[PDB]
Amino acid sequence: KRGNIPKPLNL
Amino acid sequence: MPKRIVYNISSDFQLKSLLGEGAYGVVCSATHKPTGEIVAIKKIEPFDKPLFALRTLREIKILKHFKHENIITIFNIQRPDSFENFNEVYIIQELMQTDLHRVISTQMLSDDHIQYFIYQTLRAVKVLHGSNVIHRDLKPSNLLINSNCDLKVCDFGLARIIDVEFVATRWYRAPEVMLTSAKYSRAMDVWSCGCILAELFLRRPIFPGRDYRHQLLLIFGIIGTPHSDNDLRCIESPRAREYIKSLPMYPAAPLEKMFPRVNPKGIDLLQRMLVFDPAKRITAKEALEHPYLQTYHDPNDEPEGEPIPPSFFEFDHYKEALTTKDLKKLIWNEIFS
Ligand SMILES: Nc1ncnc2c1ncn2[C@@H]1O[C@H](COP(=O)(O)OP(=O)(O)O)[C@@H](O)[C@H]1O
Ligand SMILES: [Mg+2]
């Protein structure tokens, strides 16, 4: 996306 | 899916699962058979009491007005087959995978995640405040979340336009709101954002009061008891000022000591959010400019919004209160427009 996007969650 | 849940909507939809149930709203995911899209549908029974219909109307108008990444998108509202048979409102929206309350309670979030979540919340709050709208019900369960970490605010029925009822959860309520008869302010929303940020660091509500007195006691126990008249200027209600002078005299608790492992920049932002004096409380815009969020801050991509006049919620200002039937027509206008 727009840069250093956080790691995705497991939901 | 709870067989007791019934939606009077097109057979083209197939309910999938119950996502939320309350006295005001019921939310379920549902499949639109013809396209295969899975959506979220919020059912509301607005016509037993004006209060319910006013909330419905305020929520729908706000939803339709904003086109913002952090404000839940509304796809459409179901059209009843007739005015006589119009008894429930079904708001169709983009489906999110879960809410922030569920996340904070089932997951260990990194500092990065926290930055990204509070950043998005403040980003929605900024465009709201810039439009002269205050949410007033900001809390983790009203922050919708997806796997990729995108966040969107929902539940705008208790909003108000600046210058018997549904009450916001006391745990997130600003102290000037529980004390004085305080006029709606942008600062009250920031106070809630502070409790949310704190909730993200702690993984539990920072101020879970039992009631009104306990709430105040918990808040001051952390932010320090306002003592001098300089500190009490913001409070009108004389009764309120005397109650405050009866509390234990608490100093500001040292947040960084109590929670040594939280990013110091994060504690700094949090402290600026939980300030007693609403006039000295950081704004959503300044919060987005705080060092703790420099990783996601972008001054050219933070919608400021545009003023919405009070007449937008005109129906909230009648000498002679509007009847159920009046509001039904106003809601109908909204649906078919
Ligand atoms: N668009 C949506 N996508 C996924 N879940 C949603 C959506 N809207 C609401 N929900 C779920 O339903 C819950 C209640 O919705 P909310 O809009 O806050 O209504 P209420 O007025 O009943 O609190 C949320 O906390 C969330 O878990
Ligand atoms: Mg809600």
Side-chain angles (χ1 to χ4, degrees), chain B residues 17 19 25 59 65 103 127 137 151 193 208 219 237 260 291 310 313:
Chain B
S17 56
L19 311 183
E59 169 159 28
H65 184 274
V103 169
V127 80
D137 198 17
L151 177 153
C193 288
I219 289 169
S237 172
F313 289 168

Short mmCIF file of all heavy atoms in Angstrom, two decimals, chain B residues 17 19 25 59 65 103 127 137 151 193 208 219 237 260 291 310 313:
data_model
loop_
_atom_site.label_atom_id
_atom_site.label_comp_id
_atom_site.label_asym_id
_atom_site.label_seq_id
_atom_site.Cartn_x
_atom_site.Cartn_y
_atom_site.Cartn_z
N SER B 17 -23.79 -14.62 8.77
CA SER B 17 -23.64 -14.70 10.22
C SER B 17 -23.92 -13.42 11.03
O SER B 17 -23.74 -12.30 10.57
CB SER B 17 -22.25 -15.25 10.57
OG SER B 17 -21.23 -14.47 9.99
N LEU B 19 -23.19 -10.64 13.34
CA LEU B 19 -21.96 -9.96 13.72
C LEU B 19 -22.16 -9.06 14.94
O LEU B 19 -21.22 -8.78 15.69
CB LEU B 19 -21.45 -9.13 12.53
CG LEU B 19 -21.40 -9.90 11.20
CD1 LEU B 19 -20.82 -9.02 10.14
CD2 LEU B 19 -20.54 -11.14 11.36
N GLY B 25 -29.23 -1.72 17.19
CA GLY B 25 -28.90 -2.34 15.93
C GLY B 25 -28.51 -3.80 15.96
O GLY B 25 -28.08 -4.31 16.97
N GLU B 59 -27.46 8.73 11.59
CA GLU B 59 -26.44 7.79 11.12
C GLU B 59 -26.43 7.69 9.58
O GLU B 59 -25.38 7.70 8.94
CB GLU B 59 -26.67 6.41 11.77
CG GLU B 59 -25.85 5.26 11.18
CD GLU B 59 -25.69 4.06 12.11
OE1 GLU B 59 -26.57 3.82 12.96
OE2 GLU B 59 -24.68 3.33 11.98
N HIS B 65 -22.87 11.10 3.57
CA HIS B 65 -22.13 12.31 3.31
C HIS B 65 -20.64 12.15 3.12
O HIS B 65 -20.07 12.80 2.26
CB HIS B 65 -22.37 13.34 4.41
CG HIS B 65 -21.71 14.66 4.15
ND1 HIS B 65 -20.40 14.92 4.50
CD2 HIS B 65 -22.17 15.78 3.54
CE1 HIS B 65 -20.08 16.14 4.11
NE2 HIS B 65 -21.13 16.68 3.52
N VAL B 103 -10.27 -7.43 18.33
CA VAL B 103 -8.85 -7.53 18.04
C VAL B 103 -8.02 -7.32 19.29
O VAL B 103 -7.17 -8.15 19.62
CB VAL B 103 -8.39 -6.47 17.00
CG1 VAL B 103 -6.84 -6.45 16.94
CG2 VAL B 103 -8.98 -6.78 15.60
N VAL B 127 -11.36 14.44 9.69
CA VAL B 127 -12.29 14.85 8.64
C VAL B 127 -13.66 15.10 9.23
O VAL B 127 -14.45 15.91 8.71
CB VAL B 127 -12.37 13.82 7.48
CG1 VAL B 127 -13.26 12.65 7.85
CG2 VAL B 127 -12.89 14.52 6.23
N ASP B 137 -19.20 8.80 20.25
CA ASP B 137 -19.32 7.40 20.69
C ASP B 137 -18.12 6.62 20.24
O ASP B 137 -18.24 5.45 19.89
CB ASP B 137 -20.59 6.78 20.08
CG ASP B 137 -21.04 5.51 20.80
OD1 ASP B 137 -20.59 5.29 21.95
OD2 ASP B 137 -21.86 4.74 20.22
N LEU B 151 -8.61 0.33 8.85
CA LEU B 151 -9.56 0.63 9.91
C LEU B 151 -10.61 1.65 9.47
O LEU B 151 -10.29 2.63 8.80
CB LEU B 151 -8.81 1.17 11.15
CG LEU B 151 -9.60 1.61 12.38
CD1 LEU B 151 -8.76 1.46 13.64
CD2 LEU B 151 -10.08 3.05 12.21
N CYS B 193 -10.30 9.00 21.99
CA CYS B 193 -9.19 8.43 21.24
C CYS B 193 -8.03 8.11 22.18
O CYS B 193 -7.29 7.14 21.96
CB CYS B 193 -8.74 9.38 20.13
SG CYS B 193 -9.95 9.47 18.77
N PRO B 208 -12.22 1.71 33.50
CA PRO B 208 -13.49 0.98 33.62
C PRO B 208 -14.30 1.30 34.87
O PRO B 208 -14.42 0.48 35.76
CB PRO B 208 -13.05 -0.48 33.59
CG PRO B 208 -11.77 -0.44 34.37
CD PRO B 208 -11.08 0.85 33.87
N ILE B 219 -10.22 8.24 36.50
CA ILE B 219 -9.58 9.21 35.62
C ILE B 219 -8.57 10.09 36.37
O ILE B 219 -7.41 10.19 35.97
CB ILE B 219 -10.65 10.13 34.95
CG1 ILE B 219 -11.44 9.34 33.91
CG2 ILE B 219 -9.98 11.36 34.32
CD1 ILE B 219 -12.68 10.05 33.37
N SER B 237 -20.76 24.30 36.04
CA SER B 237 -21.58 23.79 37.14
C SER B 237 -20.90 23.91 38.50
O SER B 237 -19.99 23.15 38.81
CB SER B 237 -21.94 22.32 36.88
OG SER B 237 -22.58 21.74 38.00
N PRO B 260 6.77 0.82 31.36
CA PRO B 260 8.12 0.95 30.81
C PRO B 260 8.39 0.38 29.43
O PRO B 260 9.32 0.83 28.78
CB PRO B 260 8.99 0.31 31.88
CG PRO B 260 8.12 -0.72 32.43
CD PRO B 260 6.80 -0.02 32.57
N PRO B 291 5.26 12.93 16.67
CA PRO B 291 6.38 12.05 16.32
C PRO B 291 6.04 10.56 16.32
O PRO B 291 6.56 9.81 15.50
CB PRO B 291 7.44 12.42 17.36
CG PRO B 291 7.17 13.87 17.61
CD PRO B 291 5.66 13.89 17.72
N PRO B 310 -25.63 23.28 10.95
CA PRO B 310 -26.50 22.61 11.93
C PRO B 310 -27.82 22.16 11.32
O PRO B 310 -28.41 21.17 11.78
CB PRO B 310 -26.73 23.68 12.99
CG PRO B 310 -25.45 24.50 12.94
CD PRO B 310 -25.14 24.58 11.46
N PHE B 313 -28.90 18.55 10.59
CA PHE B 313 -29.67 17.77 11.58
C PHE B 313 -30.84 18.65 12.10
O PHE B 313 -31.17 18.66 13.27
CB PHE B 313 -28.80 17.32 12.75
CG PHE B 313 -27.79 16.26 12.41
CD1 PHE B 313 -26.76 15.93 13.32
CD2 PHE B 313 -27.88 15.52 11.23
CE1 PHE B 313 -25.86 14.88 13.06
CE2 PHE B 313 -26.98 14.48 10.96
CZ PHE B 313 -25.97 14.16 11.87
#
